[PDB]
Amino acid sequence: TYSITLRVFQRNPGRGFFSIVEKTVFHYANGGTWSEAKGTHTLTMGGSGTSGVLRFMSDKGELITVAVGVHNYKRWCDVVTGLKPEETALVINPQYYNNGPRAYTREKQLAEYNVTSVVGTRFEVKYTVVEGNNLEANVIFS
Amino acid sequence: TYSITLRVFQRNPGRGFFSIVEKTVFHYANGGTWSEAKGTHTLTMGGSGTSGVLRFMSDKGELITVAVGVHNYKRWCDVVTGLKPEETALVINPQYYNNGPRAYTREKQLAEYNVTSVVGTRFEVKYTVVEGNNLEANVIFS
Amino acid sequence: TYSITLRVFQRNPGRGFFSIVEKTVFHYANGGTWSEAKGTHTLTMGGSGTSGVLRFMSDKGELITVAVGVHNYKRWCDVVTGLKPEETALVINPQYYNNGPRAYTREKQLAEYNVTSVVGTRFEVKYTVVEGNNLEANVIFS
Amino acid sequence: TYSITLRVFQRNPGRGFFSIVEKTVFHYANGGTWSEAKGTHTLTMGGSGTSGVLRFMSDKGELITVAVGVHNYKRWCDVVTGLKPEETALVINPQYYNNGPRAYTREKQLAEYNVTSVVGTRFEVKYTVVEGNNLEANVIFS
Ligand SMILES: CC(=O)N[C@@H]1[C@@H](O[C@@H]2O[C@H](CO)[C@H](O)[C@H](O)[C@H]2O)[C@@H](O)[C@@H](CO)O[C@@H]1O
Numbered sequence: 001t002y003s004i005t006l007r008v009f010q011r012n013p014g015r016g017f018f019s020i021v022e023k024t025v026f027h028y029a030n031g032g033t034w035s036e037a038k039g040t041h042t043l044t045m046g047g048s049g050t051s052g053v054l055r056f057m058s059d060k061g062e063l064i065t066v067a068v069g070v071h072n073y074k075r076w077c078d079v080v081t082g083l084k085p086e087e088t089a090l091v092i093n094p095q096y097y098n099n100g101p102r103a104y105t106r107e108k109q110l111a112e113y114n115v116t117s118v119v120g121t122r123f124e125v126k127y128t129v130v131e132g133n134n135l136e137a138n139v140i141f142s
Numbered sequence: 143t144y145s146i147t148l149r150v151f152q153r154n155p156g157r158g159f160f161s162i163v164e165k166t167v168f169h170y171a172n173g174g175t176w177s178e179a180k181g182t183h184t185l186t187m188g189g190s191g192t193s194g195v196l197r198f199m200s201d202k203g204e205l206i207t208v209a210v211g212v213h214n215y216k217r218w219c220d221v222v223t224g225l226k227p228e229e230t231a232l233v234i235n236p237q238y239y240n241n242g243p244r245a246y247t248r249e250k251q252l253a254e255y256n257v258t259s260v261v262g263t264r265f266e267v268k269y270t271v272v273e274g275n276n277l278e279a280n281v282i283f284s
Numbered sequence: 285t286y287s288i289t290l291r292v293f294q295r296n297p298g299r300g301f302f303s304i305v306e307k308t309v310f311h312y313a314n315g316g317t318w319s320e321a322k323g324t325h326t327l328t329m330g331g332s333g334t335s336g337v338l339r340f341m342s343d344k345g346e347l348i349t350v351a352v353g354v355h356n357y358k359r360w361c362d363v364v365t366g367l368k369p370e371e372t373a374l375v376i377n378p379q380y381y382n383n384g385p386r387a388y389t390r391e392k393q394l395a396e397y398n399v400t401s402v403v404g405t406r407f408e409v410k411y412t413v414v415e416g417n418n419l420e421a422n423v424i425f426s
Numbered sequence: 427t428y429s430i431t432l433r434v435f436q437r438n439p440g441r442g443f444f445s446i447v448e449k450t451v452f453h454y455a456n457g458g459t460w461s462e463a464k465g466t467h468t469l470t471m472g473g474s475g476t477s478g479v480l481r482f483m484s485d486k487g488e489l490i491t492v493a494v495g496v497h498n499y500k501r502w503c504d505v506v507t508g509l510k511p512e513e514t515a516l517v518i519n520p521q522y523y524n525n526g527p528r529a530y531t532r533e534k535q536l537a538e539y540n541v542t543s544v545v546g547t548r549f550e551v552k553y554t555v556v557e558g559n560n561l562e563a564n565v566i567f568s
């Protein structure tokens with residue numbers, strides 16, 4: 001089994017304040033589950049080869065997803081910003097598989113990824129524990 | 143816009159204790175978002191014609207989903223029990239649309255639904271406010 | 285150190301839905317901390333001889349406190365109902381110490397406590413793990 | 427009644443991740459209640475003349491309290507850092523009243539407060555809505 005524990009840091013009040021509005025788990029590797037403990041969010045998965053997505057919305061209306069998973073025994077992550085209301089995590093998560101439009105960024109097995117939304121909000125996923133079955137990462141909004 | 147606010151009541155410690163492990167929103171009607179306030183869970187949707195699903199897991203390993211939405215301006219709900227680990231909410235939610243295997247129970251536009259899992263856990267969704275754009279319902283595990 | 289993990293069961297929608305509105309920790313035994321994990325609430329204490337209180341309010345306005353702690357290496361609990369708005373947990377917790385009017389109930393070291401409020405809400409605290417440093421209890425609103 | 431809604435921003439992972447470990451409400455002005463909604467924390471009070479405290483602990487073990495309230499119809503705030511484990515919020519909140527050693531800081535009715543802890547963690551409380559009965563503030567760990 002694999003687990004990924006996320007700590008969420010929001011740096012800049014100017015960018016608004018984000019909260020989770022959706023949490024999905026992909027059906028590969030025997031699925032998995034999100035849980036919360038001490039302000040953190042942990043994705044527990046039945047094995048290597050699946051993932052999950054957290055969608056955030058700011059009190060300014062901005063919508064973004066954070067994807068984390070394990071691909072061939074190595075952690076991966078991605079961030080998608082500038083989402084329309086209809087582009088829910090339910091739509092996004094499957095796009096990393098079956099030759100979907102996001103599978104390429106899963107295949108990179110990134111230990112860190114950052115991007116800045118068209119509206120000017122910076123986002124970063126950085127793994128602090130990059131090896132083993134108990135993975136850790138920070139999610140930073142700025 | 144439509145919103146559905148859920149209060150979760152767990153009645154019987156013998157059945158274990160459930161917590162949310164996944165939350166999905168379907169992409170119709172301009173999507174939607176889950177939010178938590180005062181222990182309750184609210185699904186806010188851009189209009190009539192979409193839905194969302196909460197998946198629960200008990201500390202005894204039992205997995206079940208609760209689906210709520212609005213179909214042609216009337217509320218609906220459903221409960222699916224006896225799920226395998228790979229049957230995530232991500233898999234379940236879309237099954238209510240595109241002539242999927244659960245669309246029939248969405249079309250009923252039920253104001254109340256109850257079922258008992260094969261392992262003996264009772265589940266009920268009962269709307270306390272059944273009309274208008276601000277819908278309310280209790281979710282009861284027993 | 286000692287810990288007490290609580291699982292909250294709410295059995296009867298007719299009594300309203302309760303949520304936590306305050307959490308205190310008494311300052312003996314090197315204090316302690318409340319944390320949430322998987323829908324449960326854990327009080328971690330620096331040793332034997334302290335306690336904490338959760339105050340709950342129903343959406344019908346009813347106010348009650350649940351007290352749990354360790355006294356001379358044995359778990360204790362109490363429930364106070366019919367609280368006025370000014371009787372916050374900050375007022376209640378200390379009443380269990382220093383000639384306070386509730387000290388006697390700490391001294392009982394109860395592994396179970398039941399009480400019904402004047403307005404008719406049943407409350408129970410029942411420890412499921414009653415020995416050791418990792419205690420567990422169900423809190424039942426009926 | 428008065429309310430104060432807090433949004434918590436954590437800017438620097440190097441200082442560790444903070445979570446709430448205690449929430450108190452002082453017993454003047456008919457008391458009050460803490461509630462969570464969309465990742466924010468609201469203290470609702472029965473009138474002017476009371477307050478509440480959130481105690482935070484970082485995963486590095488640092489302990490700090492944030493106090494907010496209304497004094498003579500104006501918002502106030504304070505931050506106390508370098509707390510020992512036994513200095514719980516239950517100890518801190520009352521120190522703002524009755525010849526307590528922190529009463530002076532309530533009397534200042536500050537709309538902003540900044541302080542850096544001895545171990546090097548910056549803390550700020552900044553009200554974004556500074557007038558009326560529905561107050562708003564950002565809490566920034568830097
Ligand atoms: C070892 C590993 O990470 N494999 C990845 C695949 O995961 C497997 O997928 C199958 C279903 O096809 C099944 O669910 C297995 O349990 C699961 O481990 C899969 O994610 C592919 C997708 O391109 O990547 C790896 O091969």
Ligand SMILES: CC(=O)N[C@@H]1[C@@H](O[C@@H]2O[C@H](CO)[C@H](O)[C@H](O)[C@H]2O)[C@@H](O)[C@@H](CO)O[C@@H]1O
Nearest residue numbers: 169170171172189190191192212213214215
């Ligand atoms: C009015 C209503 O509830 N209509 C339902 C449909 O919802 C619409 O779906 C389309 C896409 O096909 C689009 O997203 C609209 O915004 C949305 O209102 C749809 O849910 C169907 C599915 O069978 O049922 C109703 O017709």
Ligand SMILES: CC(=O)N[C@@H]1[C@@H](O[C@@H]2O[C@H](CO)[C@H](O)[C@H](O)[C@H]2O)[C@@H](O)[C@@H](CO)O[C@@H]1O
Nearest residue numbers: 311312313314331332333334354355356357
């Ligand atoms: C062993 C035990 O539970 N003792 C209880 C006391 O707790 C001790 O309290 C002192 C106070 O200075 C100190 O904080 C110790 O750390 C702590 O163990 C205390 O709760 C008394 C209060 O009546 O009851 C027990 O003796």
Ligand SMILES: CC(=O)N[C@@H]1[C@@H](O[C@@H]2O[C@H](CO)[C@H](O)[C@H](O)[C@H]2O)[C@@H](O)[C@@H](CO)O[C@@H]1O
Nearest residue numbers: 453454455456473474475476496497498499
């Ligand atoms: C108007 C106001 O903020 N007054 C403050 C006091 O609050 C009053 O306190 C009394 C105490 O009996 C009572 O609870 C009232 O409801 C409440 O408004 C109190 O906080 C004092 C303490 O120094 O400061 C102000 O005067």
